[PDB]
Amino acid sequence: LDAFQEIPLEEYNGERFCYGCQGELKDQHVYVCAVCQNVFCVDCDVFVHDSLHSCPGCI
Ligand SMILES: [Zn+2]
Ligand SMILES: [Zn+2]
């Protein structure tokens, strides 16, 4: 894993779930933050905006 990609579920062959839900990436894409733990959901890119930080994992 490297810089942010939305990887098709098809290609990825890898870590399945976003760290935030401890739930699954699966709705459409695979997301990564190489910066931080590096796997996301679509819920998860949004996760931060009110409740957290600019990114979730980054702290
Ligand atoms: Zn999630
Ligand atoms: Zn991050």
Swiss-Prot record:
Location in the cell: Nucleus
Domain of life per record: Eukaryota
Tissues expressing this chain: Widely expressed, with higher expression in skeletal muscle.
Function: Component of the general transcription and DNA repair factor IIH (TFIIH) core complex, which is involved in general and transcription-coupled nucleotide excision repair (NER) of damaged DNA and, when complexed to CAK, in RNA transcription by RNA polymerase II. In NER, TFIIH acts by opening DNA around the lesion to allow the excision of the damaged oligonucleotide and its replacement by a new DNA fragment. In transcription, TFIIH has an essential role in transcription initiation.
Family: Belongs to the GTF2H2 family.
Subunit description: Component of the TFIID-containing RNA polymerase II pre-initiation complex that is composed of TBP and at least GTF2A1, GTF2A2, GTF2E1, GTF2E2, GTF2F1, GTF2H2, GTF2H3, GTF2H4, GTF2H5, GTF2B, TCEA1, ERCC2 and ERCC3. Component of the 7-subunit TFIIH core complex composed of XPB/ERCC3, XPD/ERCC2, GTF2H1, GTF2H2, GTF2H3, GTF2H4 and GTF2H5, which is active in NER. The core complex associates with the 3-subunit CDK-activating kinase (CAK) module composed of CCNH/cyclin H, CDK7 and MNAT1 to form the 10-subunit holoenzyme (holo-TFIIH) active in transcription. (Microbial infection) Interacts with varicella-zoster virus IE63 protein.
Protein name in UniProt: General transcription factor IIH subunit 2
Organism: Homo sapiens (Human)
Parent-protein residues present: 328 to 386 of 395
